[PDB]
């Protein structure tokens, strides 16, 4: 029962740790966990324990991984 | 006088769960069935309930399947 | 005069059924017949009565064929 | 002396009726002459007196032709 | 505490007259010396003062020609 | 608990002069140390001493390197 729908569906990712993919406007995807959202990025854990901050005007969707 | 029709024409889609092709700016399409939208995202579910979250701004088009 | 002309110009194109084509930031076009327009989007009816929502922040231009 | 020099450079455009190129974001250009602007796009004509409604968000920028 | 830097790195590029190369987001460059910025866009002049208006929300990046 | 966790974790970067890869959405990246942030656009400087003005919509990701 969300009004937020978008943002309730990726702070369950981000409670779940759900692998995703991410798709970017590049063409291009990451892959990796979601740690934490605001109204302009994302933080992506990836593999390897590397770190990004993602632009969310960037991506074009998230999808699980798995 | 029948303000918002795009919101009103997507939640259509949703009532009768009517397969869509969503086009991207990337040039890539997604395929399936939306569940919800809003001011940001909507949700997309394939053929066995895999749930994407479509950014609106990263989309081109929404047309029905045919 | 019309203080909102991107906004009259597609009402017009509304009104008439003038066909059209609205070529996409992806590059590519659509064809078909623009039936209503808000700020998020427009509908545009194909040959085949097939309905398409556009979002606005997609489009590049808007051309009548 | 203006403080919102992108319109008042379109209007003189305008008014002038210069010819321009307009290179938009999918990278390809249109020529012609811009007829009127206002926040969410500009009219072009072009040397046949094809009129288009060109969106002002995919511009990416407005050149003179000649 | 020390608002605005973009803006200001811009005037400041202005001022100098420094030559600069600015890519845009279709992944193709413009040269020329930057005359003038407002919230929308940025006049930028060739080496014989032609004026190209360049949409802000079409650039990746301005850094000078070096 | 910052709420404001985007600009934080670039603050960071600035504070901490942590090497970076920016990409950009034409694809390609930058390399280089971030030196300021603000709501449009921030500042990498790479290894030549190049300042460059990179706008934030034009961002993809920002990585440490």
């Given at each position: 029962?969300?009004?937020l729908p978008s943002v309730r569906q990726?702070?369950?990712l981000i409670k779940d740790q759900t692998?995703?993919?991410i798709?970017?406007?590049?063409?291009?995807?990451?892959?990796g966990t979601i740690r934490?959202?605001?109204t302009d990025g994302l933080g992506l854990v990836?593999?390897?324990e590397r770190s990004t901050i993602v632009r969310?005007?960037?991506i074009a969707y998230i999808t699980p991984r798995r």
């Amino acid at each position: 029962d969300s009004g937020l729908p978008s943002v309730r569906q990726v702070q369950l990712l981000i409670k779940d740790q759900t692998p995703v993919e991410i798709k970017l406007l590049t063409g291009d995807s990451l892959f990796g966990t979601i740690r934490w959202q605001d109204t302009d990025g994302l933080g992506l854990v990836d593999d390897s324990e590397r770190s990004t901050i993602v632009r969310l005007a960037a991506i074009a969707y998230i999808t699980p991984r798995r």
